[PDB]
From a paper:
A single ER‐localised Fic protein, FICD (HYPE), catalyses both AMPylation and deAMPylation of BiP. FICD is a class II Fic protein (with its αinh N‐terminal to its Fic domain) and an ER‐localised type II, single‐pass transmembrane protein, with a short cytoplasmic portion and a large luminal‐facing catalytic domain (Worby et al, 2009; Bunney et al, 2014). Mechanistically, monomerisation relieves a repressive effect allosterically propagated from the dimer interface to the inhibitory Glu234, thereby permitting AMPylation‐competent binding of MgATP.
The crystal structure of dimeric FICD suggests the existence of a hydrogen‐bond network, involving the side chains of Lys256 and Glu242, linking the dimer interface with the enzyme's active site, impinging on the AMPylation‐inhibiting Glu234. Mutation of the dimer relay residue Lys256 does not result in large conformational changes in FICD. (ii) The dimeric dimer relay mutant FICDK256A displays a clear MgATP density up to and including the γ‐phosphate phosphorous atom. As noted in other Fic AMPylases, this Mg2+ was coordinated by the α‐ and β‐phosphates of ATP/AMPPNP and Asp367 of the Fic motif (Xiao et al, 2010; Bunney et al, 2014; Khater & Mohanty, 2015b). By contrast, in the active sites of FICDK256A or FICDL258D MgATP and MgAMPPNP assumed AMPylation‐competent conformations: their α‐phosphates were in the canonical position, as defined by AMPylation‐active Fic proteins lacking inhibitory glutamates (Xiao et al, 2010; Engel et al, 2012; Goepfert et al, 2013; Bunney et al, 2014). As a result, in‐line nucleophilic attack into the α‐β‐phosphoanhydride bond of ATP would not be sterically hindered and the Nε2 of His363 would be well positioned for general base catalysis (and EV4C and D). Concordantly, the RMSD of ATP between the wild‐type FICD and monomeric FICDL258D was 2.17 Å (and 2.23 Å for FICDK256A's ATP). The disparities in the manner of FICD‐ATP binding are well explained by a monomerisation‐induced increase in Glu234 flexibility (mediated by weakening of the dimer relay), as reflected in the lower melting temperatures of FICDK256A and FICDL258D relative to the wild‐type dimer and localised B‐factor increases in their respective crystal structures.
Numbering used by the authors:
A (entry chain A), B (entry chain A): 103 to 436
Amino acid sequence: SLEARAALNQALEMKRQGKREKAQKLFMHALKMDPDFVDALTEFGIFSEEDKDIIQADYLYTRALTISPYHEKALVNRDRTLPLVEEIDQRYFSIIDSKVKKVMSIPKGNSALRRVMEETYYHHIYHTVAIEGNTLTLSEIRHILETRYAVPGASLEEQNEVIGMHAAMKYINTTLVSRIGSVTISDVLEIHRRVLGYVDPVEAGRFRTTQVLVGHHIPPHPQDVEKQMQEFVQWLNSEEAMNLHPVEFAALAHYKLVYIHPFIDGNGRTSRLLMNLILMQAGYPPITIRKEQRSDYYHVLEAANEGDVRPFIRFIAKCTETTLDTLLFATTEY
Amino acid sequence: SLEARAALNQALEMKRQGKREKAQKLFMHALKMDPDFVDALTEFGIFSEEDKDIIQADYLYTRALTISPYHEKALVNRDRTLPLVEEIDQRYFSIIDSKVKKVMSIPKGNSALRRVMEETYYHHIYHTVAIEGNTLTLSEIRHILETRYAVPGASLEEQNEVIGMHAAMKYINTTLVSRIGSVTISDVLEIHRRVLGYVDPVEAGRFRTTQVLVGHHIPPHPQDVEKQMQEFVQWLNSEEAMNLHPVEFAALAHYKLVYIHPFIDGNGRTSRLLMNLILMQAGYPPITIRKEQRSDYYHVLEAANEGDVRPFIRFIAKCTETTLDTLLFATTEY
Ligand SMILES: Nc1ncnc2c1ncn2[C@@H]1O[C@H](COP(=O)(O)OP(=O)(O)OP(=O)(O)O)[C@@H](O)[C@H]1O
Ligand SMILES: Nc1ncnc2c1ncn2[C@@H]1O[C@H](COP(=O)(O)OP(=O)(O)OP(=O)(O)O)[C@@H](O)[C@H]1O
Ligand SMILES: [Mg+2]
Ligand SMILES: [Mg+2]
């Protein structure tokens, strides 16, 4: 492409000109033009290291080698950054584990903690539906679940989504948390049943029969969905997956489920519930993917489809840390 | 019982005294005291004939013989009334068939008719939920189904019941009406699924596992429910049932289903939908059991349990006629 090289050649000049803005947009626009443009990736990676964003740099070098495996400028930079980010990632998970041990060391009966867990429960439901486009407020959700009376000027669908979540959550907490290691299709179906039961009871708790598009992702064909779910379940209960880091295992479980997209709707909600199940079985608190992180959440998912899950694994880890911060703040406060 | 005979002996005296009130209450109160009091039944039957209520009289004579088969006063009166009401019942069904032929003779495309069918559709849903204790108005139901937005100050359950009905009705009309003669368990499950899906998706479309009380009726034990439903389906598709009068067949189908009470909730609604299916397959319009007829509806059901279904069959026939009157009034008007 002619216009692809134009933007990149314009980008380098601005960088070495001494731009205050830094012409980061010029680089982004180049890869907007052609995202598989090996030269634009490496040079953008080099630019990222100067701003001390080595993880972003490594991502770009990794993406370049999937396109052009024997691109030398990528290969030499990759070999340097490959083990460096491996360390940085490991170090981050140690920082998580430390904050988790602080939370785990607290006794369950602690009165200050249980206040926070009660308040943050309503927040959990808000964010998982809000990220879909649910327009219900926190106080509205509080009113719906406690009173069981509909709020004025809001679709019954949106209000049924809230009830579906609370049902699914109470089910998980009651039944599924107590059994560590072994999970089945039936378990996933029973979560989804309650998630999408009050909205669409016909399709609730069974696989889709039609092919769909999820953002920019094309999941396995309905005929292949069962086969994929059969493999997904095997992976969950495999020794490999047990030996993975809880946060990492929780993340990979999330992605794999939304990748398969076995249901017509409610795949994200159920995946995030399954994510939080995995964590709570491993002794971690249930984490929140906030409403505000929608764009980022989609970008890292898109990145995972193109063949690098690490950004998504980091995103889940970012959320985990943010949760642990919130709990330790409120618990220490009260 | 001493107090049972007291009221009855008091009743006869008042009747033959020449009471303007007629001491009908004295007779009712006697059978309130003891409903299996053979002497009170026969004498109340005799009293009913004087007011030209021979069907009511026959009922009482029939109830007496289940208790005391060889009670002479009942036996002689029964033998007289037995064929008389048989004629009266047959004559009523002829009066129905005539009014049905007037309705059936109208072309489907008729513009005046389709106005009525559209308006009365919302009435159908109102009455079937209103009779349960649903507190939604006609305009509220109209708003819920058209806008799909919840009305202010009404339980989500009540509003989900409305959506459940509309779903079940649209399903029946689309799928089930086109196949005359053959119905399965799966079909009944698929109706109930949509009826109770939006309220309780967990229990929607499957048999209850717990024994319950329905008014004053004890249905078959959960273990026996499947066996009863298996027999119920056989009866529906039997030649006997095809040769029954549509209104009668529709009625018996209703009662048999609510008798079995296979689901935890939503047995009446589904039964009334199945009732109206049977009618529409036989070429009759779907009929309405009004909200106001709740007490009567329960009394005739209780009577059917004690071992005389005829009152219920008449009640359904009464509703059918009332429907046919409403249609022919509105159709002729417009
Ligand atoms: N590019 C992508 N690749 C894989 N999965 C994706 C991608 N984009 C989005 N997803 C996932 O698919 C979900 C959308 O599918 P679906 O509508 O079945 O889920 P939902 O639960 O209805 O929506 P939400 O999770 O927002 O409530 C998203 O929530 C997300 O988790
Ligand atoms: N004595 C009785 N014997 C047999 N069946 C009865 C008796 N009394 C009531 N019923 C039936 O059982 C139904 C009640 O059971 P259930 O609650 O499962 O039905 P529902 O659909 O939830 O209630 P409704 O029909 O009022 O909406 C009544 O609607 C009626 O049709
Ligand atoms: Mg969705
Ligand atoms: Mg009920």
